[PDB]
Amino acid sequence: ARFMTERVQVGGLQVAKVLFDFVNNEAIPGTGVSADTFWTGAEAVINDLAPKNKALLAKRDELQAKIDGWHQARAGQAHDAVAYKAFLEEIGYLLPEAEDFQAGTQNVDDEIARMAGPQLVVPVMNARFALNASNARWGSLYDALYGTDVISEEGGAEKGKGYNKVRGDKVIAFARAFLDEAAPLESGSHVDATSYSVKNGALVVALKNGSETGLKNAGQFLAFQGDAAKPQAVLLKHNGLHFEIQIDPSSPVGQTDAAGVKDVLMEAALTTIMDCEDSVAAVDADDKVVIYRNWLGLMKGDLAEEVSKGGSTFTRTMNPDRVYTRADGSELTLHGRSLLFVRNVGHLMTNDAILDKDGNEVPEGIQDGLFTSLIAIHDLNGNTSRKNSRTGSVYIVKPKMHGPEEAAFTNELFGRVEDVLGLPRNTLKVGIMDEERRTTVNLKACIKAAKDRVVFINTGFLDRTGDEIHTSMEAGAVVRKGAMKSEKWIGAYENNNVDVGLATGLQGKAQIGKGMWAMPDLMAAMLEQKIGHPLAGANTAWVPSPTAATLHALHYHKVDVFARQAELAKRTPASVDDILTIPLAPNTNWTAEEIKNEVDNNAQGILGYVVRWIDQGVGCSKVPDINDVGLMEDRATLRISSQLLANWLRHGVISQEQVVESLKRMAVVVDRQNASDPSYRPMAPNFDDNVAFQAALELVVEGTRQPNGYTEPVLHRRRREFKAKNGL
Ligand SMILES: [Mg+2]
Ligand SMILES: [Mg+2]
């Protein structure tokens, strides 16, 4: 028997037993909501909103088909932008710009509304990653520098396995230069400090020449830990972000330092998105329970994992808040943890963890809203040892929405969930991903549809490129994947998001955010390049790891984002006509070598990701590209690569035999790259029977058939196929 799920009858619903029991025995106790109340309300929401959800998806399909037909009816003609835009308007794709308004969201935590800094995104299915992300609010700058390529190993500065002082002295010097910039002394350089102490309410820095100095701006000093005359830490603030100079002259690093400094502790990942979507693989009730159970551990504060470090073992847990003494004897407490959002899945998928009264699968987005909000009640009512929101809000990221009617449906869904759970109206806040064309070109109206719930807008630029390719699939051959960043549309898309965010009053109430740095080991490059995100007026942007959060925090000390937003609020707004410029290749006269490099690079990226998704249920993998650069891959990069190959195939840039040959060749490369993993099974040489290879092949050769180019229908089907065959 194929795909087996044991269910029980719950009113008119059929609920997977594993999920029923998880909700009743783990999520519900401590919320003050009875299981009967919850399940009866859930069934009402499902029965009312599932038909609306289905009609929204039918509308996507209808519009894509009309666009397909529009280009087909104009095969071989030069693109007529004016006729295209009248068509998009007449069919209801491009809607009138929304009337002016200001967002009304209230009760937003400071990390979102009033601060600028990094935002970490991690798969919530991995409890170790989730724990580290919760704790990444504070990060060791010395560890981030010593451990990454920010500091070159040249000149005998190798990391090695111990503490290489040659390297460590470079780390220390980099950090002193940061201190000179972010907390300048009135005289001299932190490089010459011999002592940090507190006297008469001010930081006093003794220098090697025997004099003492204060800070140039003495108000940057806030508080300390330990004795004022010999503090263990001094707490500073700059651009709204905190950092500690940590002092211990008996520590291995401290005893090499004239002032005993052992580290600089940076306030780093202000917020974290615990992901249930593009970075996880969860295809059935068993997988979804694991997801929900980790979110539950975060919301109750008891998420914990045993880890082997040193020779022994200890239990990793969520860190407490941090306590400091002010010079007047009062106590100052800082949040010890990143403020958590949860990313629900979007409107597309259904799953068979719940069947409705007609035996149909229930939309997964509706389920996530019910279950993740139920679980968040543990935070809202204080049934937790680790508070998340201090304002009575839950922060849900809603991805992959197309246009303002779909934003209104999320607003409606969240209100219905609140009613089921007895939550005050607008408790459930929404982070709106701007990552689909129909949202971009209607963005102001999309925000307006959730104007009292909005807590962010963010340019998921990789999904957005995937939608760009699928939407104009029939128009012609698109440019190479690496050429997209220079096309007209994408710069206008990024600027539009900031312009609309500022014009709709998000400042002071929500984040205007930007995308993920996807090269986890190229931290020197990240430090060079990602300053562009705060310079663009985004008060947050995505990083892949706690280390990258610590390093990206340095950018917010170089750029005052809110002041930058004031400047950018004056510029001419981005043009929808630029956004409507389809990234078609001027001609298809690429060198045969150029074509081979594009096909091979996409084929490797697809296969390196898909094999781990299908065989191991891993939704986020680092995959070397054909230059051996390690790329962080999730479903959004798979969407781009599969859709580009489908597009080149559809327009005869490449042949099917060609794409198949490249996939087989790059599969062998992928197998080699994974050969040292004992849990890895190769794809070659039996490609016909290999589920993962067939999944990759389907996404490419049938890329034109996937709804808006989404990869989940194939991945979910094939992962379940693999799980069933192997007893997983
Ligand atoms: Mg905290
Ligand atoms: Mg997304």
XYZ file of C-alpha atoms and ligand atoms in Angstrom:
730
model
C 0.000 0.000 0.000
C 1.610 3.167 -1.243
C 1.714 6.227 1.080
C 0.325 5.205 4.455
C -0.960 7.564 7.133
C -3.025 6.323 10.061
C -5.833 8.788 10.727
C -8.732 9.143 13.144
C -12.108 10.830 12.662
C -12.337 14.245 14.377
C -15.786 15.634 13.625
C -15.821 15.854 9.837
C -11.999 15.860 9.603
C -9.688 12.876 9.239
C -6.534 13.763 11.192
C -3.285 11.814 11.149
C -3.033 10.187 14.530
C 0.542 11.327 15.057
C -0.570 14.932 14.547
C -3.772 14.568 16.594
C -1.781 13.244 19.553
C 0.972 15.824 19.208
C -1.597 18.639 19.293
C -3.674 17.193 22.141
C -0.852 15.979 24.378
C 1.980 18.419 23.614
C 0.736 21.661 22.046
C -2.588 22.108 23.895
C -1.700 21.594 27.593
C -0.850 24.954 29.112
C -2.651 27.109 26.531
C -6.011 27.192 28.308
C -7.632 26.096 25.020
C -9.389 22.734 25.134
C -8.751 20.225 22.365
C -12.486 20.126 21.563
C -12.626 23.915 21.150
C -9.518 23.834 18.985
C -10.544 20.997 16.652
C -14.118 22.251 16.204
C -12.805 25.715 15.362
C -10.123 24.313 13.065
C -12.738 22.367 11.102
C -14.874 25.494 10.673
C -11.883 27.485 9.373
C -10.938 24.681 6.987
C -14.478 24.337 5.641
C -14.843 28.092 5.135
C -11.417 28.995 3.760
C -10.271 25.939 1.791
C -12.615 26.684 -1.161
C -11.362 30.278 -1.234
C -7.779 28.984 -1.193
C -8.522 26.723 -4.161
C -10.088 29.587 -6.137
C -7.000 31.757 -5.533
C -4.817 29.022 -7.023
C -7.179 28.647 -9.996
C -6.804 32.390 -10.603
C -3.005 32.043 -10.685
C -3.350 29.276 -13.256
C -5.859 31.284 -15.323
C -3.612 34.351 -15.478
C -0.471 32.387 -16.359
C -2.376 30.665 -19.170
C -3.542 33.988 -20.578
C 0.011 35.356 -20.451
C 1.300 32.188 -22.125
C -1.349 32.677 -24.814
C -0.496 36.357 -25.235
C 3.136 35.611 -26.070
C 2.214 32.634 -28.215
C -0.169 34.786 -30.289
C 2.792 37.123 -30.935
C 5.490 34.611 -31.838
C 8.372 36.307 -33.640
C 7.208 39.898 -33.127
C 9.014 42.657 -31.227
C 7.777 43.168 -27.661
C 5.087 45.870 -27.585
C 5.266 47.132 -23.997
C 2.244 49.427 -24.283
C -0.039 46.646 -25.550
C 1.385 44.256 -22.965
C 0.635 46.593 -20.075
C -2.927 47.272 -21.282
C -3.412 43.489 -21.439
C -2.041 42.931 -17.931
C -4.431 45.662 -16.732
C -7.479 44.418 -18.621
C -7.112 40.848 -17.286
C -6.732 41.921 -13.632
C -3.021 41.122 -13.210
C -1.713 44.710 -12.951
C -4.149 46.576 -10.701
C -4.532 50.303 -10.003
C -2.096 51.682 -7.463
C -3.610 51.629 -3.965
C -4.672 54.924 -2.405
C -2.251 56.527 0.059
C -2.301 55.109 3.589
C -0.104 54.535 6.626
C 0.294 51.099 8.157
C -1.557 50.836 11.462
C 0.293 47.943 13.091
C 0.573 48.237 16.874
C 2.283 46.252 19.624
C 5.449 45.502 17.645
C 8.606 44.527 19.528
C 11.559 46.937 19.377
C 13.853 44.506 17.511
C 11.546 44.805 14.476
C 10.156 48.337 14.676
C 12.897 50.413 16.279
C 16.237 48.701 15.557
C 18.385 47.925 12.524
C 20.406 44.748 12.407
C 20.768 41.255 10.957
C 17.924 38.758 10.598
C 18.860 35.076 10.708
C 16.879 32.377 8.857
C 17.237 28.725 9.936
C 15.357 25.466 9.334
C 13.253 24.902 12.450
C 13.388 21.142 11.793
C 17.018 21.153 12.988
C 16.885 21.731 16.731
C 20.620 22.360 17.040
C 20.456 25.085 14.367
C 17.331 26.549 15.972
C 18.979 26.685 19.418
C 22.093 28.341 18.048
C 19.926 30.883 16.216
C 17.903 31.706 19.334
C 21.222 32.331 21.078
C 22.731 34.292 18.154
C 21.400 37.585 19.565
C 24.909 37.770 21.073
C 27.972 36.584 19.145
C 31.708 36.411 19.783
C 33.462 38.772 17.361
C 36.793 37.038 17.995
C 35.339 33.619 17.132
C 33.712 35.021 13.991
C 36.997 36.594 12.855
C 39.328 33.741 13.854
C 37.025 31.152 12.347
C 36.396 32.691 8.899
C 38.259 34.064 5.887
C 37.823 37.657 7.119
C 41.328 37.114 8.520
C 43.777 35.683 5.982
C 45.895 32.677 6.970
C 48.845 34.193 5.042
C 52.063 34.794 6.924
C 51.676 31.828 9.244
C 48.202 32.904 10.396
C 46.603 29.496 9.872
C 43.637 28.570 12.060
C 45.091 25.208 12.995
C 43.506 23.140 15.734
C 44.544 25.279 18.697
C 45.113 28.976 19.273
C 47.613 30.390 16.790
C 48.719 33.687 18.332
C 49.930 34.944 14.924
C 46.333 34.709 13.746
C 44.860 35.765 17.085
C 46.896 38.977 17.082
C 45.368 39.861 13.696
C 41.887 39.166 15.100
C 42.649 41.432 18.058
C 43.922 44.203 15.779
C 40.847 44.029 13.529
C 38.603 44.265 16.596
C 40.549 47.238 18.014
C 40.065 49.060 14.725
C 36.329 48.394 15.033
C 36.377 49.803 18.582
C 38.227 52.923 17.375
C 35.479 53.458 14.787
C 32.381 52.537 16.803
C 33.497 53.752 20.263
C 36.292 56.262 19.619
C 38.385 57.509 22.508
C 38.799 61.207 23.214
C 42.572 60.716 22.860
C 44.576 57.826 21.481
C 43.554 54.421 20.159
C 42.024 51.413 21.863
C 45.138 49.691 20.531
C 47.051 51.276 23.424
C 44.573 50.549 26.226
C 45.986 49.114 29.446
C 42.772 49.196 31.493
C 38.982 49.578 31.113
C 37.178 50.685 34.276
C 34.302 52.758 35.541
C 34.770 55.869 37.591
C 32.396 58.620 38.458
C 29.841 57.027 36.125
C 32.054 57.092 33.036
C 34.242 54.600 31.191
C 37.932 55.325 31.886
C 40.581 53.940 29.515
C 44.170 53.930 30.716
C 46.780 54.096 27.944
C 50.289 52.693 27.585
C 51.745 56.196 27.829
C 50.449 56.489 31.405
C 47.573 58.892 30.726
C 43.861 58.117 30.961
C 41.091 59.030 28.534
C 37.334 58.698 28.196
C 35.119 57.996 25.224
C 34.698 60.785 22.693
C 30.940 60.323 23.288
C 30.755 59.255 26.915
C 27.037 58.438 26.666
C 27.928 55.339 24.655
C 28.917 53.648 27.922
C 25.887 52.071 29.613
C 26.788 49.545 32.302
C 29.190 46.840 33.405
C 29.475 43.395 34.922
C 31.660 42.708 37.935
C 33.455 45.321 40.016
C 33.459 48.845 38.581
C 37.216 49.104 39.261
C 38.034 45.893 37.373
C 34.946 44.967 35.371
C 34.525 41.643 33.628
C 32.602 43.411 30.868
C 31.825 46.966 29.784
C 28.568 47.479 27.850
C 28.542 50.035 25.030
C 25.914 51.175 22.548
C 26.272 52.572 19.023
C 23.604 53.040 16.330
C 21.188 51.402 18.711
C 23.151 48.188 18.891
C 25.085 46.943 21.885
C 28.509 45.386 22.325
C 30.617 44.365 25.254
C 34.345 44.601 25.704
C 34.987 41.388 27.743
C 37.936 41.447 30.103
C 39.720 38.490 31.714
C 43.513 38.759 32.142
C 43.739 35.089 33.183
C 42.099 33.782 29.996
C 44.272 32.423 27.170
C 43.492 35.406 24.934
C 43.260 37.931 27.758
C 46.723 37.221 29.078
C 48.148 38.248 25.668
C 46.315 41.597 25.800
C 47.661 44.725 27.488
C 44.180 45.483 28.887
C 43.161 41.894 29.526
C 40.572 41.991 26.731
C 39.454 38.503 25.778
C 36.697 39.307 23.297
C 34.163 41.755 21.974
C 30.602 40.404 22.274
C 28.319 41.777 19.594
C 24.563 42.202 19.635
C 23.907 40.443 16.425
C 20.882 38.464 15.246
C 18.154 40.783 16.518
C 15.517 38.573 15.000
C 15.360 35.060 13.609
C 12.933 33.429 11.252
C 12.318 29.839 12.356
C 11.544 28.345 8.991
C 8.926 25.804 8.097
C 9.122 26.571 4.337
C 11.958 26.761 1.786
C 14.814 25.459 4.004
C 13.055 22.291 5.318
C 11.745 19.057 3.792
C 8.454 18.078 5.444
C 6.073 16.055 3.320
C 3.742 14.169 5.707
C 2.278 14.303 9.208
C 5.395 12.733 10.769
C 7.646 15.488 9.349
C 5.192 18.262 10.243
C 5.001 17.082 13.861
C 8.803 17.366 14.121
C 8.572 20.957 12.770
C 5.759 21.908 15.134
C 7.425 20.226 18.128
C 10.589 22.315 17.708
C 8.517 25.487 17.424
C 6.765 24.332 20.605
C 10.113 23.888 22.389
C 11.088 27.405 21.388
C 7.764 28.872 22.564
C 7.929 27.094 25.938
C 11.631 27.838 26.348
C 12.514 24.181 26.895
C 14.081 23.294 23.508
C 17.268 21.440 24.351
C 19.779 19.173 22.663
C 22.655 17.075 23.981
C 25.900 17.867 22.286
C 29.366 16.398 22.510
C 31.952 19.138 22.895
C 35.309 18.713 24.651
C 35.483 15.070 25.644
C 32.238 15.148 27.512
C 28.611 16.038 26.856
C 26.447 18.924 27.853
C 22.931 20.143 27.215
C 22.518 23.121 24.902
C 19.549 25.335 25.887
C 18.129 28.774 25.149
C 20.181 31.487 26.891
C 18.684 33.763 29.579
C 18.585 37.541 29.478
C 21.768 39.450 30.350
C 22.045 41.524 33.543
C 24.370 44.523 34.044
C 25.017 47.039 36.835
C 24.769 50.731 36.042
C 27.192 53.060 37.813
C 24.350 54.441 39.953
C 23.611 50.907 41.279
C 20.497 50.275 39.182
C 20.121 47.086 37.127
C 20.003 46.957 33.334
C 18.664 43.841 31.573
C 19.125 43.141 27.856
C 17.291 40.488 25.849
C 19.535 37.409 25.650
C 17.856 35.823 22.632
C 16.810 36.673 19.092
C 13.194 37.676 18.676
C 11.469 34.882 16.835
C 9.291 34.824 13.800
C 7.921 31.612 12.328
C 7.758 31.219 8.547
C 4.594 29.326 7.606
C 4.251 27.780 4.166
C 2.345 29.767 1.526
C -0.949 29.176 -0.220
C 0.026 26.456 -2.699
C 0.422 23.112 -1.069
C -1.892 20.690 0.621
C -0.937 17.616 2.628
C -2.686 14.489 3.812
C -2.020 15.075 7.517
C -5.654 16.240 7.509
C -8.454 15.336 5.101
C -11.683 17.326 5.006
C -15.234 15.999 4.969
C -15.008 15.326 1.208
C -11.779 13.345 1.606
C -9.668 16.132 0.103
C -6.255 17.140 1.411
C -6.261 20.299 3.549
C -4.104 23.321 2.538
C -0.800 23.267 4.412
C -0.747 27.047 4.894
C -4.096 26.949 6.686
C -2.758 24.151 8.907
C 0.469 26.023 9.703
C -1.493 29.131 10.722
C -3.690 27.131 13.106
C -0.897 25.032 14.632
C 1.922 27.571 14.881
C -0.447 30.157 16.404
C -1.860 27.637 18.898
C 1.705 26.826 19.930
C 2.614 30.509 20.237
C -0.036 30.886 22.960
C 2.592 29.486 25.345
C 4.544 32.705 24.777
C 1.467 34.969 24.859
C 0.142 33.668 28.196
C 3.543 33.313 29.887
C 3.515 29.491 29.923
C 7.210 29.553 29.046
C 10.617 29.856 30.647
C 11.923 32.063 27.775
C 9.686 34.972 26.762
C 9.651 35.868 23.068
C 7.378 38.856 22.390
C 7.160 41.548 25.082
C 4.160 43.145 23.320
C 1.621 40.312 22.921
C 2.348 39.593 19.232
C 3.096 36.496 17.163
C 5.194 37.114 14.049
C 4.323 34.910 11.053
C 6.196 35.199 7.749
C 3.878 34.452 4.831
C 5.834 33.626 1.650
C 5.055 33.291 -2.041
C 1.860 35.395 -2.174
C 0.639 36.643 -5.593
C -1.163 39.992 -5.436
C -3.382 41.793 -2.944
C -6.337 39.386 -2.935
C -3.944 36.717 -1.620
C -2.700 39.174 1.006
C -6.314 39.804 2.019
C -6.814 36.036 2.282
C -3.883 35.799 4.704
C -5.441 38.667 6.679
C -8.748 36.783 6.718
C -7.059 33.494 7.680
C -5.191 35.113 10.573
C -8.417 36.711 11.865
C -10.210 33.358 11.747
C -7.330 31.680 13.595
C -7.536 34.394 16.263
C -11.269 33.735 16.636
C -10.692 29.959 17.059
C -8.036 30.571 19.729
C -9.691 33.494 21.535
C -6.807 35.838 20.689
C -7.241 39.651 20.503
C -7.722 40.926 16.958
C -4.405 41.482 15.121
C -2.338 39.453 17.602
C -1.006 37.559 14.561
C 1.387 39.835 12.705
C 2.573 39.116 9.163
C 5.962 39.431 7.498
C 5.101 39.869 3.828
C 7.576 38.344 1.387
C 7.816 40.411 -1.813
C 8.944 37.542 -4.018
C 6.368 37.090 -6.818
C 5.743 39.409 -9.757
C 2.031 39.908 -9.091
C 2.933 41.127 -5.590
C 5.833 43.371 -6.686
C 3.790 45.271 -9.288
C 0.851 45.663 -6.816
C 2.940 45.980 -3.664
C 1.268 48.987 -2.070
C -2.137 47.290 -2.368
C -0.707 44.060 -0.896
C 0.556 45.904 2.195
C -2.783 47.734 2.456
C -4.650 44.408 2.560
C -2.862 43.580 5.841
C -2.166 47.139 6.954
C -2.832 46.501 10.672
C -0.807 43.256 10.763
C 2.262 44.071 8.696
C 5.604 43.818 10.481
C 7.799 43.488 7.427
C 8.282 43.500 3.735
C 11.317 41.713 2.308
C 12.608 41.165 -1.205
C 13.014 37.385 -1.592
C 14.967 38.032 -4.759
C 15.678 34.394 -5.677
C 12.060 33.236 -5.609
C 11.298 36.480 -7.414
C 13.681 35.558 -10.243
C 12.066 32.135 -10.423
C 8.648 33.745 -10.848
C 10.110 36.109 -13.422
C 11.304 33.203 -15.573
C 8.119 31.165 -15.299
C 5.816 34.117 -15.930
C 7.495 35.029 -19.233
C 8.333 31.398 -20.080
C 6.675 31.712 -23.502
C 8.136 35.139 -24.366
C 11.601 33.928 -25.365
C 14.931 32.770 -24.003
C 16.010 34.522 -20.798
C 19.549 35.640 -20.004
C 22.035 33.427 -18.204
C 21.469 33.090 -14.482
C 24.503 35.203 -13.589
C 23.302 37.955 -15.945
C 20.049 38.509 -14.021
C 21.589 40.785 -11.395
C 22.302 43.332 -14.152
C 18.923 43.307 -15.813
C 16.676 46.322 -15.508
C 13.881 44.681 -13.685
C 15.660 43.504 -10.608
C 17.120 46.833 -9.503
C 13.730 48.469 -9.926
C 12.174 45.576 -7.952
C 14.587 46.127 -5.038
C 14.162 49.910 -5.016
C 10.389 49.682 -5.416
C 10.186 47.640 -2.214
C 12.042 50.285 -0.178
C 10.106 53.147 -1.824
C 6.733 51.573 -1.072
C 7.823 50.561 2.434
C 8.787 54.137 3.261
C 5.710 55.628 1.564
C 3.284 53.386 3.485
C 4.604 54.295 6.933
C 6.545 51.153 7.793
C 9.285 53.160 9.464
C 8.912 52.799 13.151
C 6.440 49.965 12.885
C 8.023 47.287 10.715
C 11.093 46.117 8.905
C 12.043 46.842 5.313
C 14.344 43.940 4.602
C 16.603 42.427 2.026
C 17.835 39.016 0.952
C 20.103 36.214 1.960
C 23.885 36.073 1.654
C 24.237 32.643 0.058
C 28.037 31.999 0.226
C 28.519 30.747 3.797
C 32.318 30.502 3.707
C 32.918 33.767 1.785
C 32.685 35.987 4.861
C 35.317 38.479 3.672
C 33.204 38.963 0.548
C 30.071 39.315 2.680
C 31.734 42.033 4.769
C 32.759 43.865 1.608
C 29.479 43.588 -0.259
C 26.513 43.304 2.105
C 26.959 46.842 3.424
C 24.867 47.583 0.334
C 21.770 46.352 2.181
C 21.764 48.949 4.990
C 22.907 51.550 2.444
C 19.709 50.696 0.530
C 17.624 51.702 3.554
C 16.771 48.197 4.751
C 16.806 47.958 8.520
C 17.413 44.205 8.252
C 18.756 41.641 5.803
C 19.142 37.887 5.832
C 22.200 35.936 6.975
C 22.637 32.146 7.001
C 24.418 31.514 10.315
C 25.144 32.994 13.754
C 28.705 33.714 12.568
C 27.378 35.659 9.582
C 25.003 37.544 11.908
C 27.944 38.621 14.104
C 29.858 39.845 11.051
C 26.909 41.508 9.262
C 26.209 43.407 12.502
C 29.414 45.359 11.783
C 27.654 46.953 8.783
C 24.970 48.516 10.995
C 27.738 50.279 12.899
C 29.006 51.798 9.636
C 25.583 52.892 8.325
C 22.839 54.681 10.279
C 19.926 52.990 8.518
C 17.124 55.212 9.799
C 19.028 58.331 8.738
C 19.639 56.699 5.358
C 15.899 56.021 5.028
C 15.181 59.726 5.563
C 17.434 60.525 2.603
C 16.033 57.799 0.344
C 12.439 58.787 1.139
C 12.999 61.793 -1.153
C 14.139 60.049 -4.324
C 11.950 59.501 -7.360
C 10.031 56.215 -6.916
C 11.005 53.149 -8.916
C 9.159 52.577 -12.196
C 6.731 49.714 -12.803
C 7.712 50.025 -16.464
C 11.268 49.087 -15.514
C 9.918 46.164 -13.486
C 7.848 45.071 -16.500
C 10.995 44.817 -18.653
C 11.263 41.092 -19.381
C 14.908 39.791 -19.040
C 15.035 38.241 -22.506
C 18.377 37.469 -24.104
C 18.940 39.984 -26.948
C 20.012 37.026 -29.078
C 20.878 33.393 -28.402
C 24.371 33.527 -29.961
C 26.193 32.217 -26.911
C 29.395 30.282 -27.478
C 28.938 26.523 -27.264
C 31.315 26.701 -24.292
C 29.218 29.400 -22.630
C 26.095 27.268 -23.051
C 27.830 24.211 -21.616
C 28.970 26.191 -18.575
C 25.445 27.502 -17.945
C 23.759 24.105 -18.339
C 26.388 22.243 -16.313
C 26.348 24.805 -13.512
C 22.553 24.733 -13.193
C 22.484 20.921 -13.488
C 25.013 20.594 -10.623
C 23.236 22.990 -8.453
C 19.918 21.216 -9.029
C 21.338 17.740 -8.415
C 23.490 18.642 -5.413
C 20.392 20.017 -3.675
C 17.792 17.511 -4.821
C 19.775 14.377 -3.900
C 19.967 15.494 -0.292
C 16.349 16.604 -0.206
C 14.978 13.369 -1.545
C 17.311 10.831 0.025
C 17.956 12.508 3.391
C 15.079 14.968 3.862
C 17.521 17.906 4.067
C 15.979 21.153 2.817
C 19.069 23.373 2.889
C 22.473 22.255 1.589
C 25.780 23.860 0.747
C 26.585 22.811 -2.820
C 29.815 23.732 -4.649
C 29.226 25.361 -8.024
C 31.363 24.689 -11.096
C 33.907 27.161 -9.694
C 33.989 25.203 -6.405
C 32.269 28.057 -4.555
C 30.050 26.637 -1.813
C 26.513 27.930 -2.443
C 23.763 27.714 0.149
C 20.809 26.189 -1.707
C 17.125 26.028 -0.808
C 13.993 25.663 -2.896
C 14.276 29.210 -4.266
C 17.593 28.504 -6.005
C 16.166 25.224 -7.316
C 13.196 27.177 -8.708
C 15.535 29.488 -10.673
C 17.826 26.774 -11.999
C 15.099 24.341 -13.053
C 13.030 27.094 -14.657
C 15.998 28.507 -16.570
C 16.806 25.082 -18.033
C 13.148 24.509 -18.887
C 13.078 27.918 -20.618
C 16.241 27.283 -22.659
C 14.806 23.897 -23.571
C 11.438 25.401 -24.524
C 13.078 27.877 -26.918
C 15.623 25.525 -28.448
C 18.749 26.981 -26.871
C 19.473 23.405 -25.748
C 18.071 19.992 -26.668
C 16.580 17.419 -24.328
C 19.369 14.955 -25.114
C 21.785 17.753 -24.167
C 20.150 18.515 -20.811
C 19.917 14.805 -19.994
C 23.586 14.257 -20.812
C 24.614 17.182 -18.606
C 22.455 15.937 -15.720
C 24.027 12.479 -15.930
C 27.549 13.941 -16.112
C 26.997 16.338 -13.222
C 25.325 13.597 -11.172
C 28.698 11.815 -11.132
C 30.340 15.031 -9.902
C 27.758 15.300 -7.161
C 28.231 11.663 -6.173
C 31.966 12.313 -5.774
C 31.399 15.431 -3.743
C 29.315 13.350 -1.300
C 31.421 10.158 -1.375
C 32.817 10.799 2.106
C 29.301 10.936 3.658
C 28.495 7.446 5.000
C 24.771 8.108 4.738
C 25.037 9.112 1.054
C 23.934 6.765 -1.736
C 25.117 7.569 -5.293
C 22.771 8.420 -8.120
C 24.910 6.859 -10.786
C 25.004 4.595 -12.466
C 21.352 3.455 -12.383
C 19.698 6.754 -13.181
C 16.406 5.197 -14.351
C 15.552 3.799 -10.916
C 17.003 6.644 -8.856
C 14.214 8.678 -7.239
C 16.342 11.786 -6.698
C 17.685 11.834 -10.262
C 14.168 11.362 -11.663
C 12.958 14.232 -9.449
C 15.664 16.503 -10.874
C 14.850 15.387 -14.411
C 11.129 16.041 -13.911
C 11.742 19.559 -12.573
C 13.776 20.379 -15.694
C 12.067 18.501 -18.525
C 8.612 19.305 -17.135
C 9.553 22.700 -15.713
C 6.947 24.403 -17.910
C 4.203 22.387 -16.195
C 4.990 23.350 -12.644
C 2.611 25.972 -11.177
C 4.462 29.315 -11.285
C 7.595 27.143 -11.475
C 7.243 25.918 -7.868
C 9.330 22.896 -6.936
C 7.286 21.514 -4.013
C 4.799 19.409 -6.023
C 7.623 17.280 -7.487
C 9.825 17.309 -4.371
C 6.977 16.303 -2.053
C 5.824 13.490 -4.369
C 9.326 12.114 -4.850
C 10.401 12.429 -1.205
C 7.289 10.504 -0.151
C 8.100 7.902 -2.806
C 11.607 7.555 -1.347
C 10.369 7.451 2.265
C 7.782 4.771 1.464
C 10.241 2.503 -0.352
C 12.800 2.716 2.451
C 10.557 2.590 5.519
C 11.276 6.162 6.621
Mg 15.736 37.540 25.086
Mg 9.941 32.021 0.381
